Design a protein around this ligand. Structure first.
Ligand SMILES: [K+]
Ligand SMILES: [K+]
Ligand SMILES: [Mg+2]
Ligand SMILES: [Mg+2]
Ligand SMILES: [Mg+2]
Lengths: 48, 98, 353, 193
RNA sequence: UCUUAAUUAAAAGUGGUGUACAGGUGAGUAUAAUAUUUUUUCGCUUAACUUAAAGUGAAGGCAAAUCCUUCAUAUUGCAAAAGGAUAUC
């Protein structure tokens, strides 16, 4: 309706939800690399 | 640091130089790695030339000097001026025209 | 370099309790060498410190330091700073902020981001604007940096109110104009005032503080109040100089301040979201607090500039003033009764006193 | 061949030239009868006039060559000097609606920066502006807000020779030791006896 | 007169590199040694020199720092860095 209403509706709920999810995406990246590294060693053991 | 420099020899009032490849931090006249040539600063004159033109005798092993400049040898200012005349390096100094 | 912090002028016992608590356990330890400062917080040396407590010669009289339980004995800096700040009621009291903020700066205490805006308000309303401007000038010592868009907006509010409180007299309006310019020059040149907290707020607004249209309107207000008085030969050579700046600043504000955009639409939409970044402007109480002089400046400048024969500016400034007035009137309806903003706007714009 | 360079507003005569380069060369200001003699005399002629020791004569011949090539010291590019004093002021341009470029220009002490034209608004090299209304650069003393003077000073362009402290590295501990002996011995004569 | 914030010049320093080069002497020292030459096969090299690539972010201590301490990041995972200076609009 007015500037005050539209400006009050907006809050950090979206910004907070974004930062937290982003940190989890890079966390899953570290897990993906670690999980991948374990695969590169698993196929080498049974190979030899 | 390898350097292409001059080793002052001769007698009093009779300078004579050896172009040498030596490590920077060594005595000027110590035995170098190689002797690339010689350099006489006093200009000479042709025997039967009455024109008055002078010249300077400089013996230099250009092939051996190019290899050391290629691997990273640092010639002194005097040896740089000589190597620039023969056409190996670019002059460091030039006469201002203005 | 500087003298040791001291609090020897306190009108109340409560104030002395808060200042001496921080002094003897948060400030004075900072004057010890880095080695001895580690023994005071180590149990293994508790016995030694009991017999021969560490001493430092300040004003001759040594200051003894004994073991301090880092968890149980250390005081709460935010709360003690509040107890002291709320008990200051005399010029002799507020003079301690210069030493208090210096001590916290030495202790590397990350004070609340809003603490500056609070000190400026409670101190300026008491009639001690100089103590603030002196700490700002001596930022190398007090760490009183202008890194918040609110502090600069709060500081420039009082610099004008003091001039407005005297009906914009020449002796005072000349003084205020010197203060406003000293701040816009410190924000631009002085590097002590720059920090990550400021770079973020300047990215949300897209204007640097020294060019933010909200802050430039302050300098335009005082200037517009100097030309209105005359627009004696010495005064004429000076009055003629104010008009050169008026048309200079006004012609610059219109270039930065977009068209048909008020104070809440001036900056990006993402600027009013974070509570640590320019969210105070959403509350009608705080909007009328800053949109009062800014609205009065655009109106006054629009009239003088119009008289000089500047059609464009006469219409450009009225464009902004019309935009700020439409928004300001909304805040006047949503604001609760008995609020500061409703009173200031009623006094400055309404002229009801 | 011995081309003579025309004097500059900052170096109008020989006494000024010898005063800037330093090395106590202003003593010989009387040997050079004219500005053209300085840039014409040779090594052998400077030696007969008495320009000595050889260190000062070779130092003079060096700066004599720099002046020809235009390699002036600091402030040599000035254009508005009066009695050896030059005033530096700041010129502000709006590079963008949210920026401002400030340049240290040299203008007459009376005219304002904005009044001067682009032709006379010289920009001195080696001087910059720190923040706002502050001129930073060697021998730039402030006169007021946004103004600074640059006066001719002894050794302003001098290549200062290095000096030893307490006789250098080899004779440092000894000069300080013997000096400490002279101090103690003096106190005994004052309060001891 | 006092008190802030700066400019400038000097004087001591802090840090970087160099004083591991040059120069002097022959007191001591009695030797076959992980010494040395030739051919074949090799390995190491975190300063300086030469060519190139990538990276040059964040705090704290000393009055301050390219000083000291420490962190993030750097194929996987362990492992780094420092800033200073001059122009243009
Ligand atoms: K040696
Ligand atoms: K011997
Ligand atoms: Mg929430
Ligand atoms: Mg011998
Ligand atoms: Mg960096």
């Amino acid at each position: 309706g007015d500037a005050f209403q539209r400006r009050e509706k907006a809050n950090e709920d979206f910004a907070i939800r974004q930062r937290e999810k982003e940190k989890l995406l890079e966390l899953k990246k570290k897990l993906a690399e670690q999980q991948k590294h374990l695969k590169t060693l698993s196929d080498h053991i049974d190979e030899i | 640091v390898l350097k292409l420099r001059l080793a002052r020899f001769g007698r009093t009032n009779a300078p004579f130089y050896n172009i040498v490849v030596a490590h920077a931090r060594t005595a000027r006249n110590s035995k170098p790695l190689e002797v690339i040539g010689t350099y006489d600063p006093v200009p000479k004159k042709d025997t039967y030339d009455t024109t008055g033109k002078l010249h300077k005798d400089i013996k230099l092993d250009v092939t051996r000097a190019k290899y050391w400049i290629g691997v990273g040898a640092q010639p002194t200012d005097t040896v740089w001026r000589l190597l620039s005349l023969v056409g190996i390096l670019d002059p460091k100094y030039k006469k201002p025209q203005p | 370099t500087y003298p040791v912090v001291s609090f020897n002028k306190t009108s109340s016992p409560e104030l002395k309790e808060a200042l001496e608590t921080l002094r003897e356990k948060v400030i004075l330890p900072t004057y010890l060498p880095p080695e001895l400062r580690q023994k005071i917080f180590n149990k293994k040396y508790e016995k030694e410190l009991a017999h021969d407590p560490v001493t430092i010669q300040i004003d001759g009289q040594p200051q003894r330091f004994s073991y301090i339980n880092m968890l149980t004995d250390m005081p709460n800096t935010p709360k003690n700073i509040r107890a002291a700040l709320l008990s200051m009621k005399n010029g002799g009291d507020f003079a301690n902020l210069s030493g208090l903020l210096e001590g916290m700066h030495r202790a590397n205490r990350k004070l609340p981001y809003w603490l500056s805006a609070q000190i400026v308000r409670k101190a300026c309303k008491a009639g001690h604007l100089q103590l603030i401007l002196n700490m700002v000038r001596d930022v190398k010592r007090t760490g009183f940096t202008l890194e918040r868009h609110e502090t600069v907006n709060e500081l420039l509010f009082w610099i004008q109110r003091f001039a407005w409180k005297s009906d914009y007299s020449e002796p005072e309006t000349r003084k205020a104009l010197r203060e406003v310019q000293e701040i816009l020059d410190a924000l631009e040149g002085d590097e002590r005032h720059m920090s990550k907290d400021r770079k973020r707020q300047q990215a949300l607004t897209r204007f640097p503080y020294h060019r933010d249209p909200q802050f430039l309107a302050a300098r335009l207000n005082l200037t517009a109040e100097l030309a209105a008085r005359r627009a004696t030969s010495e005064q004429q050579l000076n009055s003629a100089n104010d008009v050169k700046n008026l048309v200079k600043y006004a012609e610059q504000l219109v270039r930065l301040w977009p068209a048909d955009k008020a104070l809440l639409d001036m900056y990006t939409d993402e600027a009013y979201v974070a509570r640590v970044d320019l969210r105070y402007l959403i509350k009608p109480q705080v909007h009328l607090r800053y949109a009062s002089f800014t609205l009065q400046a655009l109106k006054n400048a629009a009239k003088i500039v119009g008289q000089l024969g500047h059609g464009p500016l006469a219409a450009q400034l009225i464009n902004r003033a019309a935009a700020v007035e439409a928004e300001s009137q909304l805040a006047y309806a949503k604001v609760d009764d008995g609020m500061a903003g409703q009173k200031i706007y009623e006094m400055v714009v309404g002229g009801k006193k | 061949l011995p081309l003579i360079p025309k004097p500059t507003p900052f170096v109008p005569d020989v006494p000024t030239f010898l005063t800037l380069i330093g090395r106590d060369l202003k003593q010989h200001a009387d040997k050079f009868p004219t500005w053209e003699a300085l840039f014409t005399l040779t090594t052998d002629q400077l030696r007969e006039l008495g320009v000595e020791p050889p260190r000062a004569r070779r130092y003079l011949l060096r700066w004599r060559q720099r002046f020809r090539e235009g390699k002036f010291g600091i402030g040599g590019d000035l254009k508005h000097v009066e009695n050896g004093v030059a005033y530096l002021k700041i010129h502000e341009k709006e590079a963008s609606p949210t920026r401002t470029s400030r340049r240290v220009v040299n203008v007459p002490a009376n005219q304002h920066v904005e009044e001067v034209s682009e032709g006379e608004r010289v920009k001195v090299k080696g001087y910059k502006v720190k923040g706002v209304s502050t001129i930073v650069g060697p021998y730039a003393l402030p006169v007021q807000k946004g103004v600074a003077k640059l006066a001719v000073t002894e050794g302003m362009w001098e290549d200062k020779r290095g000096h030893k402290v307490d006789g250098g590295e080899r004779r440092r501990a000894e000069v300080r030791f013997k000096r400490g002996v002279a101090e103690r011995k003096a106190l005994r004569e004052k309060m001891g006896f």
